[PDB]
């Protein structure tokens, strides 16, 4: 048994509540129900014959709901930074999210970037290469996901857990 605390952040609308709900309950709902403040889900996976309990925290994307969001950085072991591939602004803002984390979260935290809604190429605004370029500039793993199609969601969380178990084992 380990126990990792995971934080989802990103602009409103990018799909944080949804990747959370796909990973934790294997369900997707098209209906937009905006998030008002923090909450968590729990999932225990298996890495190296060992149990890993994942305590995963959702946050509010709307500006007016994020007054104390920096206080949630405390004791997060990993942070998924989410954007929407069909929304360039949501992608630009990752820069600020990242900076905000460097200033307020431990330098030690593991960080993955997710370009969500990759199932909507018919409305794409961000190239997958801009994605990986950005992630490489900052030295953090990257991946395109869809909470709708269940693409790379297990992937993303397993990987991020891996990189924590790694650093923690040693």
């Amino acid at each position: 048994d380990y126990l990792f605390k995971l934080l989802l952040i990103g602009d409103s609308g990018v799909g944080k509540t949804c990747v959370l709900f796909r990973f934790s309950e294997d369900a997707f709902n098209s209906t937009f129900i905006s998030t008002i403040g923090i909450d968590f889900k729990i999932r225990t996976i298996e890495l190296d014959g060992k149990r890993i309990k994942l305590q995963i925290w959702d946050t509010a994307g709307q500006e007016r709901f994020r007054t104390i969001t920096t206080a949630y950085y405390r004791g997060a072991m990993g942070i998924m930074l989410v954007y929407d591939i069909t929304n360039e602004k949501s992608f630009d803002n990752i820069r600020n999210w990242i900076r905000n984390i460097e200033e307020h979260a431990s330098a030690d935290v593991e960080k993955m970037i997710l370009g969500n809604k990759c199932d909507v190429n018919d409305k794409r605004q961000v190239s997958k290469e801009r994605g990986e370029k950005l992630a490489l500039d900052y030295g953090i793993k990257f991946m395109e996901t869809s909470a709708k199609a269940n693409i790379n969601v297990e992937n993303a969380f397993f990987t991020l857990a891996r990189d924590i178990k790694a650093k923690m084992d040693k």
């Binding site: 008002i36 923090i38 007016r64």
Partner: peptide, 17 residues
């Protein structure tokens, strides 16, 4: 308790607005 926490967040949101 999370609900109470978030209730306070509703108040903060009103204030920012």
């Amino acid at each position: 308790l999370l609900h109470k926490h978030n209730g306070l967040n509703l108040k903060l949101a009103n204030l920012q607005d």
